[PDB]
């Protein structure tokens with residue numbers, strides 16, 4: 001609606017980093033949060049706190065909005081967001097997604113994003129992993145689109161498509177890796193719907209999200225993919241099911257964050273490895 | 285997104301009231317509007333205008349945003365909002381719902397909210413009363429959640445559930461009272477969807493709200509339940525059907541406010557009594 | 569939510585115009601954009617740039633937000649917006665729709681609005697034209713309604729209906745004209761859904777818009793009809809299908825603006841004539 005950043009601010013944040021860093025990454029990864037441990041498997045790791053990076057979304061205690069790590073993961077030059085920004089935190093989307101536009105100026109050209117999510121598809125099960133074939137951008141329908149505002153042509157068009165958001169190549173490239181390391185549960189595949197804003201859904205709210213044809217649901221991610229494609233990045237992403245969204249009045253259970261962080265933690269290596277391998281089927 | 289109130293402002297509003305008032309309420313009721321007359325049945329009633337209560341949502345002519353009454357209803361200590369704030373008035377939700385957070389600081393621990401609403405369910409009929417089993421929080425999906433912003437931990441969690449918003453006990457406790465005073469029309473039971481913002485729905489808009497599985501529709505309420513549960517309040521609520529939402533091109537009729545205020549007025553005692561009795565099956 | 573304009577600003581913009589203009593229009597037309605050429609067929613045309621009209625939505629380079637033309641089209645006094653304001657441009661709705669409230673103060677009393685749109689209905693085909701029977705105002709459900717804010721009673725009610733937005737008379741008045749000039753493709757008729765904000769829909773997003781029962785989809789229009797009826801204007805409008813919204817993973821095609829402007833251009837006279845004739849079945 002405004003967008004408080006000019007092209008310059010982006011550039012200036014880039015160049016700064018691009019000069020406290022030997023590194024020049026090609027892929028950006030975004031967790032998770034409980035893909036946290038990933039940071040380990042990197043090597044030659046250089047860390048930064050968001051709080052010291054020019055223009056980053058500042059949170060209240062920094063943070064709470066955490067760290068940017070640069071390094072090598074499976075002999076690929078990475079950079080990853082260990083902790084991210086959300087709309088429910090009160091951040092507008094050109095903030096949430098800000099990081100995303102710096103990455104591209106860094107010359108990263110693939111983005112992988114991950115996240116936890118509730119499962120809407122009855123078939124799914126806590127533990128599973130759903131690749132993201134497509135999304136419903138509900139905040140988007142109503143005005144909340146990280147693209148809203150005057151478009152800067154240096155980044156992209158006024159009117160990008162999202163029909164093809166989630167790289168095809170990568171997605172198979174990908175189920176390979178899944179059995180090509182032999183797993184009991186299959187890879188899932190489906191649609192992430194976004195809703196904002198922090199309260200968990202009602203039962204009726206679930207029924208509606210199932211009707212729309214959604215398979216999983218977070219409050220995340222959605223935004224920063226949309227603006228990845230606005231400027232080229234190939235995009236590949238996926239989701240940890242983490243709870244079966246309560247689907248009927250009767251059940252006495254209740255989503256909590258709690259169970260989410262746990263499951264996230266339980267799932268852990270799974271995962272860390274998965275991404276880690278996948279690195280290898282990203283081009284050059 | 286911000287939230288202009290700090291914890292202090294809430295507290296200060298409480299304590300003020302908590303000291304021009306003998307009273308110490310346990311239940312908060314919210315009308316209606318045309319449950320207005322309720323104020324009568326209270327006894328030992330002490331009134332206040334929003335306009336003199338520190339921090340209240342100020343409207344333009346005060347008001348237009350009206351009065352807070354404290355008293356006893358059926359030998360329960362109450363406090364009630366005679367007139368409320370809406371999003372379509374231009375108020376953000378941490379304003380609409382502000383009152384709600386003061387109540388809890390007052391030590392109220394049950395909230396009952398009522399409202400008029402259009403009927404989406406063909407079965408329903410003008411006059412009926414729909415208990416609220418659940419809700420679709422449509423403004424919510426897109427970012428408009430009274431909880432959005434940085435969470436204050438003194439009130440509640442970052443990530444409350446709403447699966448169980450509408451107290452089970454109370455809801456039966458409740459159909460009892462309905463025949464246990466013998467009424468021709470049955471109690472209805474169903475889902476309130478919220479949309480904002482003041483224009484009435486189109487026909488196509490109705491068809492969609494019916495598809496989502498909604499039974500009734502207002503522009504209200506939704507918010508302040510969500511933030512009631514964010515901090516404990518037991519929540520019980522319901523709705524006066526007030527018009528059958530025009531469901532097909534052809535009909536020459538048109539929702540108006542008008543018919544709504546009327547029906548509201550027609551329905552009157554019905555009602556006033558109902559709540560009045562219900563008081564008695566709230567704990568202590 | 570605020571609305572930065574007072575009644576005065578509207579009036580002042582009117583009177584200004586109402587006095588660099590001989591003219592006194594009765595109908596307002598809004599394109600399109602690629603109904604641009606229409607301006608030709610007017611006669612006795614007086615032009616203005618938005619940029620010089622007191623209070624108009626200013627864009628960045630003026631503009632980019634273009635010109636207001638007054639004249640006679642088929643022996644009717646018109647005034648038309650050659651280029652309009654959108655929400656995705658970052659404009660709030662009491663800006664987008666501002667023009668609309670001036671028109672009425674000008675004493676215009678019919679409004680016709682046109683627009684391009686993607687087709688959701690499989691039956692439709694690029695080239696077709698869909699009259700607007702009704703709309704889904706999705707931004708609206710969540711708070712984005714040009715009416716939101718404190719209502720000024722001089723313009724309209726607090727709670728207008730939209731059940732009957734799209735004049736019945738006019739709509740047939742209308743299919744007449746269509747064969748009454750003998751066309752191969754039939755007139756289409758259906759519902760325009762609005763979403764905001766500039767990115768094109770995903771596939772999953774389409775499936776949902778089809779489910780809701782929408783036939784076409786733009787990011788436009790919706791707003792300014794709603795506020796037309798808030799103050800009397802008879803409203804009649806329609807849509808150029810312009811692309812078949814990609815309805816399945818597989819297809820390698822992608823909406824672009826591009827194809828849209830083209831089709832718009834291809835369609836051209838079609839059209840220019842159509843409106844041109846239609847003028848004649850507007851009253852006096």
Ligand SMILES: O=c1[nH]cnc2c([C@H]3N[C@@H](CO)[C@H](O)[C@@H]3O)c[nH]c12
Nearest residue numbers: 115116117118217218219245255443
């Ligand atoms: O059942 C759900 N509904 C909505 N969001 C989530 C989420 C995501 N939302 C956040 C907590 O609600 C958490 O960070 C997670 O990534 C997990 N489960 C659900």
Ligand SMILES: O=c1[nH]cnc2c([C@H]3N[C@@H](CO)[C@H](O)[C@@H]3O)c[nH]c12
Nearest residue numbers: 399400401402501502503529539727
């Ligand atoms: O048919 C409807 N659609 C949307 N809202 C309402 C309402 C509620 N909305 C307000 C007026 O629209 C009124 O205060 C009422 O509580 C009644 N009927 C309808």
Ligand SMILES: O=c1[nH]cnc2c([C@H]3N[C@@H](CO)[C@H](O)[C@@H]3O)c[nH]c12
Nearest residue numbers: 159683684685686785786787813823
């Ligand atoms: O497939 C679509 N989806 C959403 N909007 C449009 C539109 C409208 N949106 C604008 C460009 O997206 C264009 O001005 C047009 O009037 C055309 N096609 C589509």
